């Protein structure tokens, strides 16, 4: 699936990303759509041999296992083919665990090298929410 820009912000507002420790909703939206361009379905080959799964392009080596990452992590307790799935629910939980763990949004490349900074608040502008 790819999402809509305000189809994506009700959804992730909906599963508890209107302000979740400090990140406000239109951190994720901007962070979704630099690293998966709206699509629960984008995978991405890192040159570590690591891959990243999804609409937040989670990464194998630390936070899901794929079976095909030497060392994964797996710190979200997931396989990385759940999280490609058109209902965000298991990205969105893991995305918590994420940013818990001693990360925050820097985890993110996308996040940390782009969105940070911005007026995120143009990613949910007339949106309502």
């Not at 406000?24 to 080959?45: D, H, I, M, P, Y």
């Not at 985890?107 to 949910?124: E, F, L, M, S």
Request: hydrophobic fraction near 35%; aromatic fraction near 10%.
């Amino acid at each position: 699936k790819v999402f809509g820009r305000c189809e994506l912000a009700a959804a992730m507002k909906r599963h508890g990303l209107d302000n979740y420790r400090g990140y406000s909703l239109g951190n994720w939206v901007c962070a979704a759509k630099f690293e998966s361009n709206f699509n629960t379905q984008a995978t991405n080959r890192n040159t570590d041999g690591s891959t990243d799964y999804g609409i937040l392009q989670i990464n194998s080596r630390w936070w899901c296992n794929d079976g095909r990452t030497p060392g994964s992590r797996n710190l979200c307790n997931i396989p990385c083919s759940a999280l490609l799935s058109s209902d965000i629910t298991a990205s969105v939980n893991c995305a918590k665990k994420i940013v818990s763990d001693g990360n925050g949004m820097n985890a993110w490349v996308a996040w940390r090298n782009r969105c940070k900074g911005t007026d995120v608040q143009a990613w949910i502008r007339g949106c309502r929410l």
